[PDB]
Amino acid sequence: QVQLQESGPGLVKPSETLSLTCTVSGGSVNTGSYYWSWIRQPPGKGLEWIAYSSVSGTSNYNPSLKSRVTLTVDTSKNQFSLSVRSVTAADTAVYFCARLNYDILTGYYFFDFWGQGTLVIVSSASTKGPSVFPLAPSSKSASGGTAALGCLVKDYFPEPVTVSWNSGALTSGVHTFPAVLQSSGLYSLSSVVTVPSSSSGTQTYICNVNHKPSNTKVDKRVEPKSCDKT
Amino acid sequence: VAPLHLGKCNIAGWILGNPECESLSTASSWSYIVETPSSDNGTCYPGDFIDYEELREQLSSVSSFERFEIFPKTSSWPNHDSNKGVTAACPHAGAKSFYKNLIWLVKKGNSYPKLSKSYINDKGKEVLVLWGIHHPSTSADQQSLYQNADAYVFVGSSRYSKKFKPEIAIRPKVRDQEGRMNYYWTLVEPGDKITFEATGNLVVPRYAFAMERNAGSGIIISD
Amino acid sequence: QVELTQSPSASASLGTSVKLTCTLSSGHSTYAIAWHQQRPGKGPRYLMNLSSGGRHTRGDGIPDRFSGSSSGADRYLIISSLQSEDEADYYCQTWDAGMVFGGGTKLTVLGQSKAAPSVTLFPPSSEELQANKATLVCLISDFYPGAVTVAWKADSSPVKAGVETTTPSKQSNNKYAASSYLSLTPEQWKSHRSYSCQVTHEGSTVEKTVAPTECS
Ligand SMILES: *[C@@H]1O[C@H](CO)[C@@H](O)[C@H](O)[C@H]1NC(C)=O
Ligand SMILES: [Ca+2]
């Protein structure tokens, strides 16, 4: 039923203003004894609470960030929104939206629903959309058991990219690896599908790569013709 | 025919139980009251006594008047601190203290759950219940005492019904207090139910008075 | 206002009870708290709230085996019959003037059976070579424990320049993984008969090997 989901740019340049927006389904930001809250987790570290506001009642802020944040609620769209001014690299984090439950009967204040979280990088460095290349399955894989084929998504910034297969259809056998960060300061990753080695001739595999910060979406068909093109 | 002598206290002091008014407390019956007019042993924590003049005419002559522990202190408030509610504004002989017929409930640790408490007037006479509503000076003061920034109180009988919310605000220091506390009361018909419900800011009744008020007027006469 | 202190790490064996600890700062021993679980790379999930005197009240759909208790300023989260999907960071949180969190306690669940890695090695794509680049990708998956040393070979002798290898990470299968990318020029790629990546894990090496220019 109740779901929260964050949205905003993946990347923001220093001293500009970071601006996210949570969107609530399964419930309303007017009803209930609830507050609508923001929490961030800078990479590798712990959860930090930023602030909450409710439609009616009192808002509350983390004192070391109060001066730089502004919270708003859009009753009609069932949204609430965080705005942080004058960002630096130390604002680089995954931002989570969440419902803070003032449970009247106990007096407890506990986050009972969390968003999936959205990454925000604070860098002067500009975005770089990836190149996508197909990793065709060899003949050492196709004989008695099982074969592997895939996509290489090379040289992007910042993270992340999202990779699906057959527009969302294929999920068992898919395995998208964590990226590597290269000397270059650009990221590269690979998604692999282990498969029935049917020879994979007409059995169609298309990986779908999305890097939001560069508006790059790309559908490379992994033409499983193992290099033998023309 | 035998008046109620309040000494250095006024009605407010006596009926709340300011700690200087303990000596002469409950005479059983009286035809008129003698008090000290505008003594400062009325309300030791600053604020406004609502429907005060109505109460005076009410208390001026009584045919019987029995004090009782409507909400006994060590029983009725298991999820609220019924002990920290004291103040240097209401000093009693060395320590910080408070009115004897009310309790200033505050949070237990971290969390102030909705309280709710009822009393049905079984006593056959009318019952005088008094209570208080605390207005902290700052948001911090509110969260210190009650936790709940967004708190309310509700008092209700079949005749009475009010919802209070605290006006949080720094007011002139009086007796070292920048917050204020208002005092209210209602007479509970026999067989009627009074109901408290709060998430903060409620100074609950501890003692109430079952009374049989007299015909027409009593008279209140000052020193 | 209050602070919460959790030591950063805990470990325990599958099937056991584990008792994670949150410690309220001095002068807040009567406070109540909540507990949350963050599995790796996901959002947290509320588990329960917890009173100063040990009453725990689970969230929706959180199993029976999660529970909690209190002793003085300490607040405990008991996970009984511990399962490999409990490997996660557990944050306590409370409230005072603000909402506050603990630093988290990363729980590691021990007892899962040793598994050797599963390497699959791709050569450069025709597309990439045509772009005057060449990358070999050696993709390693399904190992426990996560200590893995990777070694590239050009023909039969070691490669020094070119290589970038990810540190290993737990996965949906509750087994570790890693990528290793070797970056060459096409000309270097074609200067040898075969490259190999060699994953050695628990003193035991798995090899794969690729060659170039037979296709057309
Ligand atoms: C009672 O009265 C005197 C002066 O009239 C005042 O100084 C004192 O603080 C009062 N005490 C209380 C508890 O109200
Ligand atoms: Ca009245």
Domain boundaries, chain A: 1-124, 125-230
> What is the C-alpha end-to-end distance of chain C, expressed in Å?
71
* Statement to judge: residues C200 and C106 lie in one domain: no
- What are residue C197's DSSP bridge partners? C152, C208
How many inter-chain contacts (B to C, CB under 8 Å) are there?
A: 22
Show Cβ contacts of residue A61 under 8 Å, excluding neighbours closer than 6 positions.
Answer: A50, A51, A69, C98
Cβ pair B10, B38 in contact under 8 A: yes
CB distance C88 to C38 below 8 Å: yes
CA distance B192 to chain A (A): 26
d(CA C5, CA A20): 30
Which CATH number is associated with domain B1-223?
A: 3.90.209.20
User: How far is CA A205 from its chain centroid?
Assistant: 24
Which two three-digit tokens encode residue B127? 């019952």
Domain that holds residue C211: 112-216
β-strand A11-12 against A118-122: which pairing, if any?
parallel
CA of B129 to the centre of ligand 2 (A): 10
Cβ neighbours, 10 Å, residue C158: 9
CA dihedral B208, B182, B24, B66 (to 10 degrees): -10
Classify residue C185 by its DSSP letter: -
State the Cα–Cα distance between residues B42 and A14, nearest whole angstrom. Answer: 61
**Which DSSP string corresponds to chain B?**
---EE-TT--HHHHHHT-GGG-SS---S-BS-EEE-TT-SSS-SS---BTTHHHHHHHHSSEEEEEEE-SS-TTTS-TTSBSSS--EEEEEETTEEE--SSEEE-B-BTTB-PPEEEEEE--SSSEEEEEEEEEE-SSHHHHHHHHS-SS--EEEE-SS-EEEE---------BTTB-SEEEEEEEEE-TT-EEEEEESS-EEEES-EEEEEEPSS---EEE-
Closest to A71 (Cα-Cα) out of A26, A15, A18, A2: A18
Token duo for residue C211? 């060659």
**Given an 8 Å threshold on Cβ–Cβ distance, is B111 in contact with A60?**
no
Query: How does DSSP classify residue A30?
Result: S
CATH 1.20.58.220 corresponds to the domain A125-230? no
Q: Are residues C3 and C107 in the same domain?
A: yes
Q: How was this structure determined?
A: X-ray
Query: What one-character DSSP code corresponds to residue A177?
Result: P
Computed from CA positions of residues C39, C43, C46, C51, in that sequence, does the dihedral angle turn out positive or negative?
Answer: positive
Residue keyed to tokens 């700062």: C25
Closest CA to A117 of A211, A35, A189, A22: A22
Closest atom of ligand 1 to CA, residue B90: 13
Same domain assignment for residues C117 and C197: yes
Q: Which residues in chain A touch residue C183, judged by CB atoms under 8 angstroms apart?
A: 182
Q: Subunits touching B (CB < 8 Å, at least 3 pairs)?
A: A, C
Count of domains for chain C: 2
Provide, as residue numbers in chain B, all residues whose Cβ is less than 8 Å from the Cβ of C94.
Answer: 110
- Inter-CA distances, A24 with A8, A76, B48, Å: 15, 11, 45
C-beta separation of B77 from B111 below 8 A:
no
CA-CA distances (angstroms) from residue A188 to A119, A133, B66, C145?
17, 11, 85, 25
CA of residue A221 relative to chain centroid, distance: 24
Q: Per the CB < 8 Å rule, is B109 touching C28? A: yes
Record: contact A58-B139, CB cut-off 8 A:
yes
Q: Over C110-174, what HEC string results?
A: ECCCCECCCCEEECCCHHHHHCCCEEEEEEEEEEECCCCEEEEEECCEECCCCEEECCCECCCCC
- Candidates B148, B154, B167: best to mutate against A (most CBs of A within 10 A) is B148
Ranges of each domain in chain B: 1-223
Q: Which of C3, C52, C93 is the best substitution to test chain B (most B C-beta atoms within 10 A)?
A: C52
User: Within this chain, do residues C126 and C216 fall inside the same structural domain, yes or no?
Assistant: yes
**Rg for chain C (alpha carbons), in Å?**
24
Could you tell me which chains touch chain C, where touching means 3 or more CB pairs under 8 A? A, B
Q: Domain check: are C106 and C118 in the same one? A: no
Give the C-alpha separation, C82 to C66, whole Å.
9
Q: How far is A191 from chain C (nearest CA, A)?
A: 10
Yes or no: say if A207 and A191 are a contact pair by the CB < 8 Å rule: yes
Place of tokens 């059976």: C113
Q: How far apart are the first and last CA of chain A?
A: 53
- Cα separation, C123 vs B197, in Å, equals 73
DSSP string across C61-111: T--TTEEEEEETTEEEEEE-S--GGG-EEEEEEEESSSEEE---EEEEEE-
- CA–CA separation, C33 and B46 (whole Å): 36
Structure tokens at B178: 């920048």
For residue C52, the 8-state DSSP code is: T
How many CB atoms are located within 10 Å of the residue B20 CB?
Answer: 18
Side chain identity, residue B63? S
Residue nearest to atom 10 of ligand 1 (CA): B41
Chain C residues with CB-CB distance to A178 below 8 A: 166, 169, 177, 179
**Position A23: which residue type?**
T
Closest CA to A75 of A24, A29, A38, A32: A29
Contacts of A105 in chain B (CB under 8 A): 113-114
Q: Write the CATH number for C184.
A: 2.60.40.10
Query: Which tokens hold the place of C199?
Result: 């994953």
Written as one letter, the residue type at A203 is Q
CB atoms within 10 A of CB A89: 11
**What does each C-alpha distance from C113 to C14, C116, C117, C147 come to in angstroms?**
11, 10, 13, 14
Instruction: Give me ligand 2 centre to Cα A221, in Å.
Output: 81
DSSP label at A160?
Answer: -
CB A105 within 8 Å of CB B113: yes
* Nearby residues of A84 by Cβ (< 8 Å), 6 or more positions away: A17, A18, A19, A50, A65, A68, A69, A91
The token pair that represents C72 in the structure block: 């003085």
**Residue B175 region by backbone torsions, left for phi larger than 0, else alpha for psi between -120 and 50, else beta:** left
Last residue of some domain: C111, C132, C161? Answer: C111
Q: Which of C54, C86, C111 is the last residue of a domain?
A: C111
By most ligand atoms within 8 Å of CB, the mutation choice from B9, B14, B20 for ligand 1 is B20
Three-state DSSP at C180 gives: strand
Contacts of A101 in chain B (CB under 8 A): none
DSSP annotation of A172: T
CB atoms within 10 A of CB A7: 15
Q: How far is CA B179 from CA B92, B155, B186, C139, in A?
A: 20, 21, 24, 68
Distance B12 CA to ligand 1 centre (A): 13
The H or E element that residue C188 is part of is: helix C186-190
DSSP lists the bridge partners of residue C178 as C140
Look up tokens 């987790």; give the residue: A41
Q: What is the CA radius of gyration of chain A?
A: 22
Q: In chain C, which residues touch B (CB < 8 A)? A: 2, 28-32, 52, 94-97
3-state secondary structure of A157: strand
Q: Which of B150, B199, B201 to mutate to test the interface with A (most CBs of A within 10 A)?
A: B150
Q: What contacts A219, CB < 8 A, 6 or more positions away?
A: A206, A207, A208, A209
Cα–Cα distance measured from residue C11 to residue C90, given in angstroms and rounded to the nearest whole number: 13
Cα–ligand 2 centroid distance for B185 (angstroms)? 6
Q: How many Å from the N-terminal Cα to the C-terminal Cα in chain B?
A: 20
| Contacts of A174 by beta carbon, 8 Å cutoff, 6+ apart | A165, A191, A192, A193
Give the residue from C111, C143, C164 where a domain finishes: C111
In A92-115, which positions are buried (b, 16+ CB within 10 angstroms) versus exposed (e)? bbbbbbbbbbbbeebbbbbbbbbb
In a shared domain, residues C72 and C159 = no
